[PDB]
Design a protein around this ligand. Structure first.
Ligand SMILES: [K+]
Ligand SMILES: [K+]
Ligand SMILES: [K+]
Ligand SMILES: [K+]
Ligand SMILES: [K+]
Ligand SMILES: [K+]
Ligand SMILES: [Mg+2]
Ligand SMILES: [Mg+2]
Ligand SMILES: [Mg+2]
Ligand SMILES: [Mg+2]
Ligand SMILES: [Mg+2]
Ligand SMILES: [Mg+2]
Ligand SMILES: [Mg+2]
Ligand SMILES: [Mg+2]
Ligand SMILES: [Mg+2]
Ligand SMILES: [Zn+2]
Ligand SMILES: [Zn+2]
Ligand SMILES: [Zn+2]
Ligand SMILES: [Zn+2]
Ligand SMILES: [Zn+2]
Ligand SMILES: [Zn+2]
Lengths: 329, 323, 329, 323, 329, 323
């Protein structure tokens, strides 16, 4: 029965102190995960034109930059390997190569910064000649269960490299359970599985496909037989329920700001650790506008606060370092 | 319901276009689209807006030309924003209720020429104040609530008199929806709808609009951190007589859309603001994102529970939907 | 606290534009599934007096008519074979004959129109001399588990013919799970199962039994030991929960408009892909009245909009072509 | 969601600090903290309080000195409690609305010297009555509801006149929130917040506060047994116009905090009272518990759903948070 | 629509009789469980300075004191053994010694007071040289499944001694199910399992670690890799759901008053028998203040009533005897 | 929570008395009990009631004697029902508001002699009308709603004047709770509680009460078939100002108790009526049921969610609870 003018919702807005007292959500560095593009070789740094301010880094250069990310208190990195073209194959075998970029990077980081979380990507897209997330059948369809067998080997390779978290981004049915079963049978009892549970067939990924180098491979291909239809919301709840049942320790929605309603429903429905990925296209859009002088740089912390408000526990964001820097002040 | 792999494989419905179509939960249609327009003072004039690539400010005659195409595409309504000449701004904002102000003129012209097209006028003082704030300022520089409302009510009445089917208070004063509703009923404007901007945030995403209309607000616009508060905003506005309620900005607040729809089951609108437009269009023009993101962003609003979307993409989208 | 005259619910009704903006549901062609009665032979077309405007078609004639249904954007057909009397048996073996009408029709359509969805009917009613949905015991009771064995063979035959969806309409307990288990073990991983979950023992089916030719066989028989009591609503939720658990990809209520409350409860409770069948008797009633001049032809789109409003994702309707034609304008 | 060991091992997230940090559901920040202060009548005076180790009563000048450190640490607000000289107590409690009473003086001094610091004044008669009860007594010794409210309204207005941004009625009279709100609106104090002590229990945990301010209540304060009743208290106070609602005591009533937050989704505060403070500080000083319990107790309030916490630990906590 | 002055919530508060009629919760002796620290040897009584008024008792002295606890109607005791330093080991074997303090005490009490409930503690902390709750790996981490094997042997030893309830306080994943499986396979069909489901990594346990003598062993060690983060609430619901599924007969939150919100959520969500432990630090805080004259002795019954109000069925409290004495008046 | 045999055996908690006690969800205490009394007009008089074995009508002096034992047993309150002499009945029911009527006399006597004992008076015209209906009849023999309320308000005021702490309108007129509340507030009886008989059914279980007090109602009392309707009854009575709400009869309506408690979370009472009493006591006296059914029936009310129970078994139960 709250009614004007007895209730004037502006009164708590009148002064900073009161806005602060009633403020419902804050972003902190504990919320931030920095995705990073990792090159083969030594002394390599490459600018990504469709992600201004983000560079692909060789492992030695990654280790250097990580000193500052650690000093800033960023909890974890999410690694994405930029696989050399010649190491792409129909069988995606590079995915489980102990000498692959992801596995070498993991080992290096785990030794140099033992408290830093490493989240590896479980997916065949960086490894396939066609750029799809799994292995194709003779009709060009991404086979579910055959792909899982490769994903499982990948995941085990990561666990062997020391990754504390593996994050299946492939959208095969059942892969969370298969990976978990494998990790448990192998003794990797504490390796976390951060499921990409509600990952949509989105247009917002374009820049990442450029950054990881799968854009050329995929071409005009689409992922609608596995990634989710943008139109669907209830379906996301079913996706997440399965992944929880299958043993996921964290569940993720991707992309991010275009899907904040999904973040809210998922958090509300399951009350489980919920993550969101602020994808390459989101980062690019924001950067492009800030660089043009169309949006103030305050939009970065507004965008990230939105995720907290919607119910995410953690955010994968290419803004993680700038945000951590702003928070540190 | 104990759904478990492999008895349940959620990919099966995704296998084919036909089954994707059958199960698709939401669709965007032209019926969902409302186009905001920036309206100039002369004749035979258009102006480009540096921070909104592709959007033109339009004099009324130009508006009427373009509206023929908008109506033909089935866009149901426009939301008008006047670009007030500097010389007509004042501390009292009286131009807001001038019967020959741009908004009022534009409205009468449109109502006569396209009687089926909905016209949503903006009730707010920000295009009219020397200072660009949304209400009348006190000596400390604070936006005065109830004094501002008196101006707003006069504005809204002038819009009604001009023929506006919908007035949309975007000012975020407390209690303004009720005051406006009371004045419209008392004047006999029994069917003029009020589209409340109920949960309007103190956002950085509005920068380009200020460039567009030619016009610090944390004492009235909402803290981006706050979600529960939006439900209290909305509840008051429904009780006060709003016919529709709106969340602004849009994409950055899709969670609020969903909560608002779910809690009240009332006609719910969302504003895809100038900065959302600009970042999308900038990225598409830079070749960084595909054109397809336009419809993906609009489908998100529908999925989140919006009934209608105020969007600078309305004509592009309507075109895409007609193909 | 909404109260007159502050709140006048007529204001949004005042003008078309505002009614359009606030309109809660729309029907689109993406919602439509056309059931079709399929004859043996060549060059055969037969009018059904109790379903005015609907014809039984031989496969060649079906293929011709399907060009227009495809051009209209109708997503799928649901096939119902008109089995020759001489091919009815106690064992219902025709149900799994690779040369049966349903299996031949499926193969023909899958080749001619590869994007068109084909939903086959899994049920023994077109195949039994007695017109019941399963195999009878020596007391005249429809045996549950023995019937499932035949249903399973049927379903596999359909999958082998290329059907993208099989739709068990039999109301045996457990058949969704048994069919799913069979499809999975045989490698038909992506064959959808559209369960008739809440199918009631209704009087509204009379015309269909005429159209498929099971009316004579069933006679005065009833299906109350398997189809649901019209009086029961909570029971429908239990029926649907089982079918979801058993692996259904879609769940259906039948009949349709007489059961819209069930559609609403099912959608609300499970948030799963929900379908509704506007049965023969519903079509006949409406057609009869329109032909008499008692109801305007606008009732067709009103009837279909009701299903959307009640929460159905898709509608099996003999009006699918007229509706698609009206929508296309 | 059918989570089952060993597919689900809830220890995995606990394995490492980084994953503990990622999933941690609540954090305390300085923004959550409100420091209650006991304010004396002279100059250059502090007094120690036997039952609140480490808390000093402060004359206004001393308050202003300490407030520089409080503001520097980012504490958003103070809640003032005057220590009335015995000679100013009376049966009518008139000192409550004296414009040169301690609270009023302290407020004007603070508002001038630290304009951004929030000042929460106490609306209650207990520091002012010869008898120490929270309202005016009838011949049977019963606290009179509506008579007491009239005094309270005059008090609240005097605080508003002194510049208080928030008045916090702690009296537990029925209907006082509405009466105060009505009087503030009618006087033009449109933005003075009211922080209702909505669910305030008849508790043994207040003993040390009475020692601190220098001041049997089961006919107005709530029965500790009752939970549902708290929701009815809160609902009335929201309807009456409260901007914030409070549960007191705190830790012993964390269930009430949670229910109150969950039911109303409104700005919810909690008072970690003098006895909670004393038992913690006594135990820490006795070496029986680690200092870490301070932040653990404060994190509990956040977890339970409180937006802000009135706590004598606010400065210690703010210090810990700044390291 | 309740509004002043039609509704004045003070009216039921006006008189004792009406406060009594509407009083929502009462504490009774049926709610009380007394934890007790048990020494080896004969004729031993030891005061605990950080728990004023509580003594560690040898078994003969326990039996004497139990006469009064039984006369007061206290339903159950929770036993905590003060293990001799020399009987601590890396393998925690003393935990399952049939001649251990807990097992001897159980047997003695079960014979002397057959109606008195005995709740034994299942945990390795009193038995390990390092004071952690399980067995450590070579990185110093408490191994989950190896620890469960020892916990299981412990639990079986208690059941063999006659304990009616075993209470696992160890916070290993899955231990409820493993213990239950063991009890059932051994024929201990009616031995209750009182799970410590939501046991937090708290500072409030200090005095107990002194009383049981594990303080020296643990040193500065922490239990954050198994006990719950104080910040987390939703996580508690997941913890309890697992333990119910695994067969717990009662579920517990620990500590107590600092976690009353958890008690409320757990009771509300599961409607199962819910217990709360008013830990050593809570008892000490209260006692310290009462002894200083800072709080009246009425705080004891206020503190206990809080637990009832929050939804607990039973309370483990070192105040159980004083409270029972006050209630008996 | 996937509890399944044999991991879950619900018998384990049942194995032993101690664990049965630990998990027992509800307990009856003396605090739950309210004893209804039938009060006669002379002196040194008691009468037995044929259809209520063991219950006596008591003159006031006898009431006072017995009340010493009731108070000693801790019974919190009595509910008085006067046995009006035939000569004082009338079509206007004026005896209802006679200051020297039985109820009023009994109340003053009790309030003086046992000031802590709660006195609940009956507001209803049925003991006062020549015809025994609960209100004033029109020419068609219909119980007039608003006319009856005027009498009821005068009655209630007379009870307040006599010292009653609680008035309990049992008449089932629409809107009477509000009318009574308004009149009590307007007269200054600010703390007189109103215990609404909110969901009072047109039941066959009342037969023996009519024998007891010496006093067709389907146009005002509720249809036993109806459950949802009870929630609407209760909601109105809370909004109207009831302090407590009651369901009558009791056992035959335990579902209503539970729904009422669950929906409103307000102080909820239940009447174990004369016919419930009689069938139990008759069966116990016939040797067909054990005495234990008394406490089992009372525990049911607590389990169903009642805060207090009006019961002719209150003294027996209190005695059993004291052993
Ligand atoms: K977080
Ligand atoms: K719409
Ligand atoms: K659809
Ligand atoms: K806060
Ligand atoms: K209990
Ligand atoms: K009670
Ligand atoms: Mg999935
Ligand atoms: Mg021109
Ligand atoms: Mg508002
Ligand atoms: Mg079924
Ligand atoms: Mg000085
Ligand atoms: Mg109150
Ligand atoms: Mg656990
Ligand atoms: Mg005598
Ligand atoms: Mg009524
Ligand atoms: Zn991938
Ligand atoms: Zn504006
Ligand atoms: Zn059939
Ligand atoms: Zn006070
Ligand atoms: Zn332990
Ligand atoms: Zn009566």
């Amino acid at each position: 029965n709250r009614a004007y003018p007895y209730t004037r919702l502006r009164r708590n807005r009148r002064d900073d102190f009161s806005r602060r007292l009633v403020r419902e959500n804050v972003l902190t560095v504990d919320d931030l995960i920095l995705p990073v593009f990792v090159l083969d070789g030594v002394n390599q740094r490459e600018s990504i034109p469709s992600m201004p301010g983000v560079e692909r880094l060789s492992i030695d250069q990654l280790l250097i930059e990580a000193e500052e990310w650690v000093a800033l208190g960023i909890p974890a990195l999410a690694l994405f390997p930029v696989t050399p073209v010649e190491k792409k194959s129909l069988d995606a075998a590079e995915a489980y190569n102990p000498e692959g970029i992801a596995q070498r990077a993991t080992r290096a980081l785990r030794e140099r910064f033992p408290e830093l979380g490493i989240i590896t990507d479980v997916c065949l897209c960086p490894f396939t000649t066609h750029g799809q997330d799994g292995i194709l059948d003779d009709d060009g369809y991404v086979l579910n269960d055959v792909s899982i067998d490769v994903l499982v080997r990948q995941a085990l390779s990561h666990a062997e490299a020391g990754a504390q978290v593996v994050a299946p981004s492939d959208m095969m049915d059942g892969r969370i359970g298969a990976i978990r079963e494998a990790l448990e049978s192998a003794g990797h009892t504490n390796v976390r599985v951060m499921a990409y549970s509600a990952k949509y067939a989105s247009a917002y990924y374009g820049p990442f496909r450029d950054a990881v180098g799968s854009a050329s491979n995929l071409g005009k291909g689409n992922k609608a037989t596995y990634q989710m239809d943008p139109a669907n919301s209830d379906e996301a709840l079913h996706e997440v329920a399965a992944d929880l049942a299958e043993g996921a320790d964290m569940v993720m929605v991707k992309p991010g700001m275009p899907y904040l309603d999904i973040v809210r429903r998922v958090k509300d429905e399951f009350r489980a650790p919920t993550f969101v990925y602020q994808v390459s296209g989101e980062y690019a859009m924001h950067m492009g506008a800030i660089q043009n002088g169309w949006l103030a740089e305050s939009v970065i912390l507004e965008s990230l606060t939105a995720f907290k408000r919607a119910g995410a526990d953690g955010i994968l964001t290419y803004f993680a370092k700038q945000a951590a820097e702003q928070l540190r002040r």
